[PDB]
Amino acid sequence: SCVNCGREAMSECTGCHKVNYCSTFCQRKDWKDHQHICGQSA
Numbered sequence: 001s002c003v004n005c006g007r008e009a010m011s012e013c014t015g016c017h018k019v020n021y022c023s024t025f026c027q028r029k030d031w032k033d034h035q036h037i038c039g040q041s042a
């Protein structure tokens with residue numbers, strides 16, 4: 001679900017869609033670790 005708060009997700013990471021968060025803020029916050037891998041479909 002939201003890898004930060006609540007329900008499953010609204011959208012998936014809008015650079016790959018390999019991770020998902022309930023709202024937008026979660027994705028921007030928590031992707032600090034993910035930003036390093038985004039762009040690669042693995």
Ligand SMILES: [Zn+2]
Pocket residue numbers: 002003004005006021022023026
């Ligand atoms: Zn969330």
Ligand SMILES: [Zn+2]
Pocket residue numbers: 013014015016017018019034037038039
């Ligand atoms: Zn991504």
